[PDB]
């Protein structure tokens with residue numbers, strides 16, 4: 001995966017509302033800034049309950065958005081990342097509809113998992129109780145095959161039926177997705193919900209050996225088509241290091257909340273700790289299309305005794321710090337959970353989570369770009385967007401607070417702001433300076449300061465980070481100094497907004 005900054009965006013929420021318009025905005029307004037892009041699900045349909053992650057036909061672009069040729073067109077300039085939903089598919093798909101009509105006579109009957117598929121011999125209470133769950137209840141719902149009532153395995157919603165990833169039809173389906181991705185010259189594949197993709201009795205059915213056997217089989221099938229794979233997994237941070245050592249690339253879900261903590265308090269030990277242990281085969285982010293994950297830093301869900309990178313109280317304070325900085329907007333968006341250790345995510349834009357503080361925000365991006373891994377910037381964050389209460393009150397969907405529809409007018413208006421111009425100049429710096437293709441090193445004091453250093457062939461750069469120097473939502477004190485060496489010798493920048501860095 002190229003070591004340049006990528007953009008995460010919906011096709012219809014960045015420009016006129018299509019892949020062509022998205023590609024236009026990308027090329028015209030962000031040349032040299034984002035040379036790659038993760039296009040969020042654009043299949044048939046894209047405007048369902050789960051905003052593209054519940055497609056009926058994974059193989060077909062939503063004709064309202066464009067076509068696969070638009071993807072191929074965009075590939076001539078930008079590396080493209082796309083989601084591959086491997087765990088499940090729509091019950092409205094023709095494959096599953098056929099199983100309902102024809103039952104065991106159906107061509108696709110082996111393609112879908114049932115309780116019998118995994119538990120031919122009966123299941124105990126411990127068998128079903130130990131299954132890892134992202135959603136409440138048991139992962140089963142009622143469907144009638146021909147006329148016989150059956151318990152179909154469903155990890156998320158009853159409308160998304162899990163497929164047998166070891167069956168021929170299920171695998172044939174996954175390869176139809178891969179073949180279309182490779183046909184349109186997609187570079188990277190984000191394997192959605194792959195952690196649940198393998199079921200075996202007696203296990204949690206989440207990241208078991210059979211799961212790593214599936215990821216490796218999908219890897220080899222991908223390279224055979226020129227496709228690199230990436231796994232998305234939210235879990236306890238020690239499981240994250242375990243997983244990252246067995247796969248090609250993972251997400252760094254710990255950093256976003258860790259930077260919210262450090263910018264809220266000033267304590268940099270948790271960040272220095274994470275820097276030392278984190279997997280470096282990662283994709284770094286601050287915001288995503290979902291809420292801010294706090295589970296990731298992050299007591300274990302099943303066994304509270306395993307403590308995260310900060311005490312449970314600092315996790316509670318982090319959730320409440322977001323509620324305060326947004327003045328209750330994220331409360332309206334986040335459904336209460338009685339306690340904050342029971343929260344998965346907090347719904348708010350990352351800019352608003354910082355109280356819209358420019359100095360704090362640019363610093364967070366700077367740290368993101370200076371840690372090993374390929375950085376991504378979510379489109380709302382690329383525009384330093386605030387929470388969208390109107391869409392939230394229209395759709396009643398919590399995550400829409402961080403999914404604003406940006407017309408080309410709104411993009412060019414927000415492009416006039418200095419914080420936006422600083423981020424663009426920062427990504428260009430991150431892409432243009434060849435120091436980042438070299439070797440990484442870091443130093444720390446104790447709690448006040450931490451310095452991130454990259455030294456390459458023709459260039460060097462160091463980022464020092466002192467959140468102590470400026471505390472408060474309304475504090476304008478720069479908390480990140482930058483020094484770097486290039487063709488024009490040694491240079492410095494003590495303010496990354498007013499004095500954004502440039503390369504020779």
Ligand SMILES: OC[C@H]1O[C@H](O[C@@H]2[C@@H](O)[C@@H](O)O[C@H](CO)[C@H]2O)[C@H](O)[C@@H](O)[C@@H]1O
Pocket residue numbers: 050053054134156192193195232233234289290
């Ligand atoms: O389709 C449901 C969601 O899938 C992805 O997010 C999941 C996350 O919410 C949690 O359940 O963990 C799993 C496995 O790590 C994630 O796949 C999408 O990112 C999300 O947008 C979908 O709603």
